[PDB]
């Protein structure tokens, strides 16, 4: 069995739960059979026993690096089933925090990639920027991560009076912070070596194994669900998908640094053009009534009581709605009976497909190569294990 | 609109330029300069006990049960805080107090079960259960984390002044 | 330039009362800086805010010995700060 | 700022000069005020021992024209 060893779950490499059994002839990997479920927790079965609004917090936990972008996918899905759409301001918000979240994920993916490679200073440089972003989350939702801000009918509460200005100061500067990382890794005489020509994935093979993410975009396939199938108001913004050639760990990386750059272009716009308005649908049927209203109007209390205690009561149907979560296509197939609690909610995780590819990517590769490839797939075991 | 992240003569000037890059490690020296630069920047860390990382009014933190200024506890046991809790954390059983009013005999938030969603803060009609600002309640024993009505009411009395200020700041938004 | 840097360091050292007073601040916090005293709460605590310092460190509290008779001079605890002054320290409210 | 990495270094430096000054004064005090002669080749030893045999029982003791 080529001295088969099992990559450690506690190992600093990996996201904490990857038992990668690998039969290795000395320092060459013959076969990688990743094991999963070290973080299965039941997220899909638990949701069937919970109402739509009390299952929203599960989505933040599915892949929590990308806390909100995941919610947007459930939101969209529940809105489609109800044929309700969020108010204009809420849409821009979701794109504002949708992008901020993409940066947060890429800062995680690029810097954590380097820590496993052995570069440790980029992580500390950008985790300070991350920190500053979390604070946006907190001052908008209340929680640093795991906000629950994007709900099925829009956002929960309007932005605090003053956030936009700060999401500007930060954005105005973050670029230089990405630039710095660059001067340390993009052209390092050594980053390139450990990353270039490692885990090349063909274009036809990437579509075949369902990669659907930067992993496809890195191979040169042009597909951004945000441009091909616009969701929210990502249609009203203008950004450039960072397509790649000679797809390999280095090229895709460059792509993730480029979407960090393009997301700052989308954030700028959202700050420049966010409309005055309400942040939640006006249908007390789907969105909970404002607290001044429920404390002075009978129809609002009844709607508050029923919504919190029982639920939306989504019309019977089923939908697969996919967004472009930072990792890749995140989709929720939400079958729904007329009941207030869902019937099924398979979460498509960009990551179940990517891990599977580890085998077809890391072939004839050294132990260190496997560490580099797990990084270039941004595997968050929450989404894979669900 | 798409963009090519990495899509791409040999002249002595060029080559000599490239060879020097490999031979004297020019780009490697570039990287060292960046880190030397920050060494000179002010560190961003805070003395944790002395200085605290800023949390704005909506921070959910630790559960507390509020009381009316008069002194009557706000909760009237409608028990929908129990209904909407995602984790099944809050357990409420009630009976009419001798006054004839409606009050909770037992209100138990299991904080280890709670995932601090803040929906209970949302759901309460009298807004009796609130997400209090304190986040530092780490406990030596698991039992201490389970909280009955007396701990939460006591938590409410201790932090009422700040809870009132926080709710004061954010209620227009809600 | 640096001479003014040195004068600032001298004033910080002289700022905490006597040699013994700064030694006390030195040991429990490990940071010496001078700021206006915003308030002293009834539980022994002293609070200082400096506008010049960055957002994370512009508000700091120097904890006091036995705030409930606990020998707190060395085992400093975050919970010691009173609830009223907790939000000022965490920047929840600008007002002292 | 970066002012603080200096404390530690100071205690490294001070602990890397001691050795060089120490070895170079425990020689000039255990060799009669003169560098410890370096016997690299037989001849340097000879003159070193010849000198011992010359006077007293130690080489640093150096008899001069007045002998």
């Amino acid at each position: 069995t080529n001295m088969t060893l099992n990559f450690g779950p506690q190992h600093p490499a990996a996201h904490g739960v990857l038992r990668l059994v690998l039969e290795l002839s000395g320092e060459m990997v013959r076969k990688c059979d990743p094991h999963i479920g070290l973080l299965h927790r039941g997220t899909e079965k638990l949701i069937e026993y919970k109402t739509y609004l009390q299952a929203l917090p599960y989505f933040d936990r599915l892949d929590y690096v990308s806390m909100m972008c995941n919610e947007q996918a459930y939101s969209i899905a529940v809105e489609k089933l109800l044929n309700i759409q969020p108010p204009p301001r809420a849409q821009w918000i979701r794109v504002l925090f949708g992008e901020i979240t993409r940066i947060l994920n890429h800062i995680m993916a690029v810097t954590t990639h380097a820590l496993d490679i052995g570069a440790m200073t980029p992580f500390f440089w950008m985790f300070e920027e991350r920190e500053k972003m979390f604070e946006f989350y907190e001052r908008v939702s209340g929680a640093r991560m795991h906000a629950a801000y994007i709900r099925p009918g829009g956002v929960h509460q309007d932005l605090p009076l003053g956030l936009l200005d700060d999401i500007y100061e930060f954005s105005k500067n973050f670029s230089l912070r990405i630039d710095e990382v660059e001067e340390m890794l993009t052209n390092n005489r050594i980053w390139r070596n450990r990353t270039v020509d490692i885990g090349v994935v063909t274009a036809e093979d990437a579509l075949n194994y369902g990669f659907s993410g930067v992993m496809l975009r890195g191979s040169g396939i042009q597909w951004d669900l945000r441009k091909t199938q616009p969701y929210d108001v990502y249609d009203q913004v203008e950004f450039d998908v960072p397509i790649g050639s000679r797809g390999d760990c280095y090229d895709r990386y460059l792509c993730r640094v480029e979407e960090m750059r393009q997301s700052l272009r989308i954030i700028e716009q959202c700050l420049n053009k966010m409309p005055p308005g309400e942040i939640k649908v006006d249908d007390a049927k789907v969105s909970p009534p404002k607290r001044a209203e429920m404390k002075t109007s009978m129809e609002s209390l009844i709607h508050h009581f029923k919504l919190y205690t029982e639920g939306y009561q989504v019309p019977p149907g089923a939908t697969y709605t996919a967004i472009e979560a930072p990792k890749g296509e995140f989709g929720v197939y939400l079958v729904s009976d007329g009941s207030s609690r869902p019937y099924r909610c398979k979460i498509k995780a960009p990551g179940f497909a990517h891990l599977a590819g580890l085998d077809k990517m890391s072939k004839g590769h050294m132990l260190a190569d496997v560490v580099a490839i797990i990084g270039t797939q941004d595997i968050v075991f929450g989404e894979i294990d669900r | 609109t798409y963009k090519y992240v990495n899509k791409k003569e040999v002249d002595m000037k060029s080559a000599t330029d490239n060879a020097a890059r490999i031979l004297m490690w020019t780009e490697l020296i570039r990287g060292l300069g960046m880190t030397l630069s920050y060494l000179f920047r002010e560190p961003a860390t805070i003395n944790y006990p002395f200085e605290k990382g800023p949390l704005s009014p909506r921070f959910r933190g630790e559960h507390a049960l509020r009381r009316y200024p008069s002194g009557e506890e706000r909760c009237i046991a409608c028990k929908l805080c129990e209904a909407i809790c995602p984790a099944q954390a809050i357990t409420i059983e009630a009976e009419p107090r001798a006054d004839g009013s409606r009050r909770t005999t037992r209100y138990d938030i299991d904080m280890t079960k709670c995932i601090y969603c803040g929906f209970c803060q949302e759901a309460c009609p009298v807004d009796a259960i609130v997400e209090g600002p304190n986040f530092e309640f780490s406990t030596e024993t698991h039992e201490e984390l389970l909280y009955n009505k007396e701990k939460l009411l006591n938590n409410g009395d201790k932090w009422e002044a700040e809870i009132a200020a926080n709710i004061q700041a954010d209620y227009l938004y809600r | 330039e640096l001479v003014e840097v040195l004068k600032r360091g001298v004033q910080q050292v002289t700022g905490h009362g006597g040699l013994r007073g700064l030694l006390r601040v030195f040991f429990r916090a490990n940071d010496i800086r001078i700021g206006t005293l915003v308030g002293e709460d009834k539980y022994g605590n002293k609070y200082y805010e400096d506008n010049k310092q960055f957002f994370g460190r512009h508000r700091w509290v120097i904890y006091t010995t036995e705030m409930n008779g606990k020998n707190t001079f060395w085992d400093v605890d975050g919970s010691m700060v009173p609830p009223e002054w907790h939000r000022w320290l965490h920047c929840m409210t600008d007002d002292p | 700022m970066w002012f603080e990495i200096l404390p530690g270094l100071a205690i490294m430096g001070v602990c890397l000069v001691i050795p060089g000054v120490s070895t170079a004064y425990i020689h000039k005090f255990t060799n009669g005020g003169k560098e410890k002669r370096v016997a690299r080749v037989q001849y340097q030893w000879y003159l070193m021992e010849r000198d011992r045999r010359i006077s007293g029982v130690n080489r640093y003791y150096v008899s001069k024209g007045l002998e």
């Binding site: - | 570039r30 630069s37 000179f40 002010e42 | 330039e1 957002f55 | 700022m1």
Partner: peptide, 28 residues
């Protein structure tokens, strides 16, 4: 900040761009 105008120039020369414009210390 508090660069003193010489640590700042070593910072600018070593980095190759102006950090003064995009500082790590957020201010009012």
């Amino acid at each position: 900040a508090s660069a003193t105008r010489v640590i700042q120039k070593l910072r600018n020369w070593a980095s190759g761009q102006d950090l003064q414009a995009k500082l790590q210390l957020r201010y009012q």
